[PDB]
């Protein structure tokens, strides 16, 4: 059934650490444990091994990514920057 109303995974901390830190930390604690679709094989199997390390359960392929999320916003934009700069420099 619906076990908790508003607290999700952060129910494991109970009445500790203050509402607003426990509201804040739920946004990171979902994504760091979420399973992502592997770009290489397509299987929804990418898991976080350590800090900024991501492993496919099927492909046996390790990716250096963001600490909590697989793709950081700052690392998507920079790959689009380095591509455009490679194009608009070497021409």
């Amino acid at each position: 059934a619906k076990r908790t109303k508003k607290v999700g995974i952060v129910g494991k901390y109970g009445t500790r650490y203050g509402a607003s830190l426990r509201k804040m930390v739920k946004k990171i604690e979902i994504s760091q444990h979420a399973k992502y679709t592997c770009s290489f094989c397509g299987k929804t199997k990418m898991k976080r091994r350590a800090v900024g390390i991501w492993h496919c359960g099927s492909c046996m392929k390790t990716v250096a990514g963001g600490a909590w999320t697989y793709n950081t916003t700052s690392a998507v934009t920079v790959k689009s920057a380095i591509r455009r700069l490679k194009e608009l420099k070497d021409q």
Binding site: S39, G42, K43
Partner: protein, 98 residues
């Protein structure tokens, strides 16, 4: 012509004869049955280089699809991932003409 190959696939899935998957497709290349081999863009580089070499041997066409194995799956109207697909009878599709 990305929009059109998704409609040609729809017309060969309904009316045509073919095999999805890798080993099944590589059998039909050696049988001389395959006319066209469609590969997903995320296909392993060695499986792409083996299919291509079997195809230039058999004197067949290779299409490099503009989408990964999931998109090829939903293109074929299936609910799983298709990396390699090979058409034997185009059926009533103009896929092998383009």
């Amino acid at each position: 012509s990305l929009e059109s190959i998704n409609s040609r696939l729809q017309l060969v899935m309904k009316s045509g004869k073919y095999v999805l998957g890798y080993k099944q497709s590589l059998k039909m290349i050696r049988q001389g049955k395959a006319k066209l081999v469609i590969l997903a863009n995320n296909c392993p580089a060695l499986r792409k280089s083996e299919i291509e070499y079997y195809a230039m041997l058999a004197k067949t066409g290779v299409h490099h699809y503009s989408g990964n194995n999931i998109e090829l799956g939903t293109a074929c109207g299936k609910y799983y991932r298709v990396c390699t697909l090979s058409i034997i009878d185009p059926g009533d599709s103009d896929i092998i003409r383009s």
